[PDB]
Amino acid sequence: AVPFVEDWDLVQTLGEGAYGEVQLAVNRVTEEAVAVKIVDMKRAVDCPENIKKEICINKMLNHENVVKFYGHRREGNIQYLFLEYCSGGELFDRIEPDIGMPEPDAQRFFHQLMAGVVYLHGIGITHRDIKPENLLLDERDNLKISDFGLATVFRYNNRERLLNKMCGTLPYVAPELLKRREFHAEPVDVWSCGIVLTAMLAGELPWDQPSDSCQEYSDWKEKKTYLNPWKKIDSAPLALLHKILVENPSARITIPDIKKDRWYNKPLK
Numbered sequence: 623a624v625p626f627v628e629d630w631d632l633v634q635t636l637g638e639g640a641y642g643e644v645q646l647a648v649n650r651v652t653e654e655a656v657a658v659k660i661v662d663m664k665r666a667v668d669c670p671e672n673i674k675k676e677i678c679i680n681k682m683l684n685h686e687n688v689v690k691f692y693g694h695r696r697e698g699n700i701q702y703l704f705l706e707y708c709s710g711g712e713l714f715d716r717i718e719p720d721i722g723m724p725e726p727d728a729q730r731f732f733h734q735l736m737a738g739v740v741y742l743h744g745i746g747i748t749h750r751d752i753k754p755e756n757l758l759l760d761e762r763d764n765l766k767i768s769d770f771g772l773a774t775v776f777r778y779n780n781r782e783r784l785l786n787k788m789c790g791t792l793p794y795v796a797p798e799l800l801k802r803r804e805f806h807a808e809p810v811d812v813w814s815c816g817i818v819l820t821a822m823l824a825g826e827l828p829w830d831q832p833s834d835s836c837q838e839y840s841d842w843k844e845k846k847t848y849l850n851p852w853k854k855i856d857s858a859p860l861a862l863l864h865k866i867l868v869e870n871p872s873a874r875i876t877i878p879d880i881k882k883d884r885w886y887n888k889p890l891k
């Protein structure tokens with residue numbers, strides 16, 4: 623057995639939020655870099671469960687558009703997760719405030735986000751918190767869906783399970799999660815992918831939350847795409863946004879038909 627191979631040094635402190643601390647671990651022998659999430663199962667009614675589900679799902683995921691899972695280590699209260707390293711940073715960190723990015727790049731990113739979500743969904747799992755700070759990028763600039771701390775399975779043994787736990791991020795959360803007691807997991811994830819498309823194409827967020835009480839959300843229902851936040855979006859990708867940001871979750875577009883979308887399949891643009 624090659625000596626010293628199980629010794630990753632925590633070079634940098636990648637993240638530092640509500641979760642715990644994410645360090646950039648580099649192997650002592652190989653130098654393989656990796657991201658290490660240090661989750662803290664404290665007290666007696668918090669992470670002891672918060673992390674088991676995140677770790678249980680990660681042990682299923684296997685798509686090149688999803689952050690690869692290596693392993694984990696339960697040391698007393700400190701739980702270390704071995705996940706993929708994305709030197710690309712956050713997609714979020716590639717959106718020019720109030721501007722966006724070149725329309726071609728959005729399209730690419732949107733394809734890979736669709737890729738992973740199709741995959742995730744395939745294996746009955748919903749992320750529930752799709753947003754630019756969760757869409758990581760690597761060396762070749764490929765999109766990776768990360769952080770499955772709120773992901774849950776919505777299909778098991780071929781039975782869909784409606785949801786009712788309100789979790790995610792206000793601006794990105796779909797409308798039905800704030801107006802309906804129960805809802806289908808998948809359409810909530812497409813809606814968020816849609817909120818990302820607009821962010822990627824306008825460098826700004828449509829509204830604070832998908833509720834009548836919110837100025838812009840209402841004008842979007844008025845179809846006031848004039849000189850308002852969507853005035854920065856081209857009619858092609860705007861036509862698609864009209865289909866995703868549909869309120870009735872049952873009338874929304876579905877990942878399959880998004881692939882059949884014009885802009886989605888228009889070259890370079």
Ligand SMILES: COc1cc(OC)c(NC(=O)Nc2cnc(C#N)cn2)cc1Cl
Nearest residue numbers: 636637644657705707708709711768769
């Ligand atoms: C400073 O830019 C960065 C910020 C990051 O977020 C913590 C990362 N993180 C990653 O490489 N990957 C990951 C993968 N999974 C999680 C979870 N849960 C967090 N970070 C990398 C860079 Cl390069």
